[PDB]
Structure 1
Amino acid sequence: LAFSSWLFNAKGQLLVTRRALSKKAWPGVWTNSVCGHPQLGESNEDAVIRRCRYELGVEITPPESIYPDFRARATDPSGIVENEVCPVFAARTTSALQINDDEVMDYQWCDLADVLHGIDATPWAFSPWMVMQATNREARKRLSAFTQLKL
């Protein structure tokens, strides 16, 4: 049971993050903005809001559900197996990042189209869930909606 979220700023840029060197699974790997696990009795929406605060010190708009049926298994460079129920969301940040370096060792604000081109060309350089989520046609169209400038 898990969630993933793709965050955009009001200008429509996508935030990509790099998992800290100390993460158990996929340490050091570039990936979409945030992922995690809801707590007992917590909605996925509220888990997203909570983890964005926790890993990125940031506030967000109401998370939109963009890939509710996403579920996968993937094995990490060290063999850690992960099998997850992981509905995907998108939101916009409404405040500045304040980075938790226990979780995130780097990040970049990027153009979605560049990120998609990188994912499509060199998927091995990104976490496997970032790639499997972004290559879903419907989810990808939702990411594109979040690139619009919001004034």
Structure 2
Amino acid sequence: EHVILLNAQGVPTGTLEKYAAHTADTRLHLAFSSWLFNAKGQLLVTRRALSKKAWPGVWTNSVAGHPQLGESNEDAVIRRCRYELGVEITPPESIYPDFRYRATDPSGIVENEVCPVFAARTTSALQINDDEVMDYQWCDLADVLHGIDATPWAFSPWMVMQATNREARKRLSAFT
């Protein structure tokens, strides 16, 4: 996996190997974030494995990743969902297209990205890739939003920032 570097505008200028791109001085690159719900409306919350270089062992929204060069945002979502969760999903829907952020993890690892957010429904059972996901929980969106509002530090920075955006939160609720 590589990450796409972006300049002032979201114009791709080059690529870097994924692992090598995330350091204490991570440069701006493209990513995606996705919230998955099942047919019952429950939200899938996952805990990043201890082997993840950035934010290992952290509870976060369903799946996040980096689109590859030439790959559309939607297909990147499909690819990482199958890879980390072994699940098939409905067509990804945009919920927060202009989300951008920069955050530093406990180890000093930084994430600096233009990160559009999507939502989708799972159409198959989960088949966990323990190399990427160490735990997960199917919950009610309402309880997660309450958790995020009360103790945001207990979750990943991007999950918190995405869920606290008034418009994003409204669109997410439309999935329950």
* TM-score, reference length from structure 2: 0.83
CA distance in 1 between partners of 2:45 and 2:171 (Å): 16
Alignment of 1:61-100 (within 5 A): 61-100=90-129
CA distance in 1 between partners of 2:110 and 2:172 (Å): 27
1:133 is matched with 162
CA distance in 2 between partners of 1:31 and 1:21 (Å): 13
Deviations 1:117-144 (A, max 9, x none): 0000000000010000000111101110
Gaps of 5+ in 1: none
CA RMSD between the two structures: 0.4
CA distance in 1 between partners of 2:46 and 2:113 (Å): 20
Deviations 1:69-116 (A, max 9, x none): 000000001111110010000000000000000100000000000000
CA distance in 2 between partners of 1:136 and 1:72 (Å): 13
CA distance in 2 between partners of 1:82 and 1:13 (Å): 28
Paired residues in the alignment total 147
Alignment of 1:81-120 (within 5 A): 81-120=110-149
1:52 is matched with 81
CA distance in 2 between partners of 1:23 and 1:70 (Å): 22
Query: Following TM superposition, where does structure 1 have runs of at least 4 consecutive aligned residues deviating by more than 3 angstroms?
Result: none
Gaps of 5+ in 2: 1-29
Shift of 1:63: 0.3
CA distance in 2 between partners of 1:103 and 1:134 (Å): 23
User: Could you say which structure has the greater relative contact order, defined with CA pairs below 8 angstroms and 6 or more residues apart?
Assistant: 1
Identity %: 99
Q: Does 1:2 align with 2:31?
A: yes
Shift of 1:36: 0.4
1:27 is matched with 56
Deviations 1:6-40 (A, max 9, x none): 00001000000000011000000000000000111
Find the structure with the greater CA-based Rg.
2
1:17 is matched with 46
* TM-score, reference length from structure 1: 0.97
